[PDB]
Design a binder for this molecule. Structure first.
Ligand SMILES: *[C@@H]1O[C@H](CO)[C@@H](O[C@@H]2O[C@H](CO)[C@@H](O[C@@H]3O[C@H](CO)[C@@H](O)[C@H](O[C@H]4O[C@H](CO)[C@@H](O)[C@H](O)[C@@H]4O[C@H]4O[C@H](CO)[C@@H](O)[C@H](O)[C@@H]4O[C@H]4O[C@H](CO)[C@@H](O)[C@H](O)[C@@H]4O)[C@@H]3O)[C@H](O)[C@H]2NC(C)=O)[C@H](O)[C@H]1NC(C)=O
Ligand SMILES: *[C@@H]1O[C@H](CO)[C@@H](O[C@@H]2O[C@H](CO)[C@@H](O)[C@H](O)[C@H]2NC(C)=O)[C@H](O)[C@H]1NC(C)=O
Ligand SMILES: *[C@@H]1O[C@H](CO)[C@@H](O)[C@H](O)[C@H]1NC(C)=O
Ligand SMILES: [Ca+2]
Lengths: 389, 221
């Protein structure tokens, strides 16, 4: 718009899900100059919504796609392209160079942060209106990381959650408040959460909600709620027995609000949730051991009630199909009474599970929320690992 | 809850063809795929491949690409292993198991197994023989009586000392093959108050030959 954005609405009644975006990137990339990506996401400008994702600097088909299972390198770069077109060599815009990103638009223009570096000496640089403004060098010296999906801004201020430290144990997570590229302040993570990675965040009624990842001990997901106005936050867990991280222990009868739920240590998968009282919906893979299938569950009050079991659901990716990372996003500039909630599901094709090929790319699926009850379909990446041989 | 009951054991002469069925219940067939595994006696457990009960597409393992063929009666929730041209080293037991995740890395809930005795041999029905003791007080105030089930093919044989009733102190021994047939036996120990007083009976059923015998161990001494 030509004015900062204020999250003035609340979420709309989430009664079912309608497909919003489909990539088909790996299927088309078997015969088009498509980029190998991973860690995908979706963010909207006032003007348009786009698929964002971390490039690997090669095409699926090019011989340099070999060994793209490695997450970080100097060939990675946050890139961006039209809603539902593949991430083609000829239509991707490079947003900045790095192997961890987050990107959001504040009403006036957008902030993109790409983190780069060796693991022991990494730096974040905060791009604003496509020029580097601020940079933040490492603080704990072992892999500074961030969101992996869009951030949310209220009146110029965008909280961005960063973790620096070990994924196996206590790490230094700090919440930074930027406004227009400059750091307005930062505080350290406070609350009952025990470890923070890859926070999926959305914003309503002047407040920001982030479902993150507990990599050390959590199988239930930790939640940070940030007051963008007062520049404070808190962190608790999702009480619900409906465990949503992956791999996970099987779901209990009663769960744990102020602590990690035991069972699968040193692992996770980025994930999201829509926490709105009765209108709460959660999403987990269907498999407890692997990233196969992805499903949405209405679990009224899952944040707060520690025996909330699901009342309505929706199958998104079939359990005989692969999934991966998920994250929240909304089109904050779309017309209406409220926020249409939406999310995305990375579809990881490649190594390690499908190691007949040596690349790891992924596809993207997006859905937004309908007040209706629309019927459901499953949405497969779709490629046959056998035509690339 | 999940129960995958399979076909009964099968005897088939070399080079033949067998369709081993596996019927699912408890879960929604279509959202979990079938994992098939070979537990060959002196070797261990082998993954054979997996089928997607939603698309119908099988994966096969190297050692299995060729005669093994996965197929599904979706409509009855049944996976079947069909093996063609039964090369003898297909004497083993085949388990179907529900692959938890996509591709079937986790097999949670397994089926009871089906045993393929690939064999040129002929069905011989058994000789059930009551073995009453040459008295011999088998420990203080106890007597052990026996039942030799000789000369049958193929395995199995169901043995029950009196219709399932003598349950404690029974030792049915594994059968052993002497080239063409097996020899199996069981023992049961009772107190002297109970025998020759009640009627201990060997209730032996050879299901391949439609044979059911009840040899009464009569006191003969
Ligand atoms: C047209 O489309 C409409 C709209 O989509 C169709 O109607 C919808 O259809 C859905 C399927 O019928 C239905 O969802 C179901 O809703 C129930 C509530 O009534 C919900 O409980 C179901 O979710 C459980 O079951 C699914 C599989 O069906 C599981 O994948 C899911 O995880 C839930 O079960 C697991 O978690 C529960 C909570 O803890 C446990 O109670 C349960 O034991 C189970 O746990 C095990 O598995 C977990 C992982 O899989 C594991 O972690 C755990 O440890 C355990 O081992 C399901 O979502 C929608 O509500 C329905 N909506 C409407 C409006 O009707 C309609 O059928 C379509 N019509 C046609 C003709 O096709
Ligand atoms: C690139 O891919 C090739 C095959 O496309 C990989 O090949 C293997 O390389 C290792 C040595 O690192 C050998 O032991 C294997 O036998 C090779 N196999 C084949 C088919 O050549 C290669 O490792 C990949 N990576 C690099 C860095 O070249
Ligand atoms: C945005 O929010 C602040 C605080 O709620 C308010 O004072 C300001 O005027 C609002 N501006 C816009 C463009 O909504
Ligand atoms: Ca975890």
């Amino acid at each position: 718009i030509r004015d900062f954005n204020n999250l003035t609405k609340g979420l709309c009644t989430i009664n079912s899900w309608h497909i919003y975006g489909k990539d088909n990137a790996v299927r088309i990339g078997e015969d088009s100059d498509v980029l190998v990506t991973r860690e995908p996401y979706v963010s909207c400008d006032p003007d348009e919504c786009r698929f964002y994702a971390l490039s690997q600097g090669t095409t699926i088909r090019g011989k340099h796609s070999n060994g793209t299972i490695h997450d970080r390198s100097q060939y990675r770069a946050l890139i961006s392209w039209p809603l539902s077109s593949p991430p083609t060599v000829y239509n991707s815009r490079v947003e900045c160079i790095g192997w961890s990103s987050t990107s959001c638009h504040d009403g006036k223009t957008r902030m993109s942060i790409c983190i780069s570096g060796p693991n022991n000496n990494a730096s974040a640089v905060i791009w604003y209106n496509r020029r580097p403004v601020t940079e933040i060098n490492t603080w704990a010296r072992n892999i500074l990381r961030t969101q992996e999906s869009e951030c949310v801004c209220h009146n110029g201020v965008c909280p961005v959650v960063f973790t620096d430290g070990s994924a196996t144990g206590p790490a230094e997570t700090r919440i930074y408040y930027f406004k227009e590229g400059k750091i307005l302040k930062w505080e350290p993570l406070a609350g009952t959460a025990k470890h923070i990675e890859e926070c999926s965040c959305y914003g309503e009624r002047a407040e920001i909600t982030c479902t993150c990842r507990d990599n050390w001990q959590g199988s239930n997901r930790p939640v940070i709620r940030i007051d963008p106005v007062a520049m404070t936050h808190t962190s608790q867990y999702i009480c619900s027995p409906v465990l949503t991280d992956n791999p996970r222990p099987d779901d209990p009868t009663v769960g744990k609000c102020n602590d990690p739920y035991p069972g699968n240590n040193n692992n996770g998968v980025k994930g999201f949730s829509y926490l709105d009282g009765v209108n709460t919906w959660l999403g987990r893979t269907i498999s407890i051991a692997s990233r196969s299938g992805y499903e949405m569950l209405k679990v009224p009050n899952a944040l707060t009630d520690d025996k909330s079991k699901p009342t309505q659901g929706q199958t998104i990716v079939l359990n005989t199909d692969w999934s991966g990372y998920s994250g929240s996003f909304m089109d904050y500039w779309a017309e209406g009474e409220c926020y249409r909630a939406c999310f995305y599901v990375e579809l990881i094709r490649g190594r390690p599970k499908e190691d007949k090929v040596w690349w790891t790319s992924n596809s993207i699926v997006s859905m937004c929320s309908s007040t209706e009850f629309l019927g459901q379909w499953d949405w497969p990446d779709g490629a046959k690992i056998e035509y690339f041989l | 809850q999940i129960q995958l009951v399979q076909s009964g054991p099968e005897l088939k002469k070399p080079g033949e063809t067998v369709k081993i069925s596996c019927k699912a219940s408890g879960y929604t067939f279509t959202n979990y795929g079938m994992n098939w595994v070979k537990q060959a006696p002196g070797k261990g457990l082998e993954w054979m491949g997996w089928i997607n009960t939603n698309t119908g597409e099988p994966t096969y393992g190297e050692e299995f690409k060729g005669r093994f063929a996965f197929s599904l009666e979706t409509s009855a929730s049944t996976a079947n292993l069909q093996i063609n041209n039964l090369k003898n080293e297909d004497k083993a037991t085949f388990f179907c198991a529900r692959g938890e995740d996509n591709f079937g890395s986790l097999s949670d809930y397994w089926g009871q197994g089906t045993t393929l005795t690939v064999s040129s041999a002929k069905t011989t029905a058994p000789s059930v023989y009551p073995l009453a003791p040459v008295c011999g007080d088998t420990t203080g105030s106890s007597v052990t009586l026996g039942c030799l089930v000789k000369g049958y093919f193929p395995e199995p044989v169901t043995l029950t000392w009196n219709s399932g009733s003598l349950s404690s102190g029974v030792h049915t021994f594994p059968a052993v093959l002497q080239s063409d047939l097996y020899t199996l036996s069981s023992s049961v120990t009772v107190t002297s108050s109970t025998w020759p007083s009640q009627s201990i009976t060997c209730n032996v059923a050879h299901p391949a030959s439609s044979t059911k015998v009840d040899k009464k161990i009569e006191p003969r001494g």
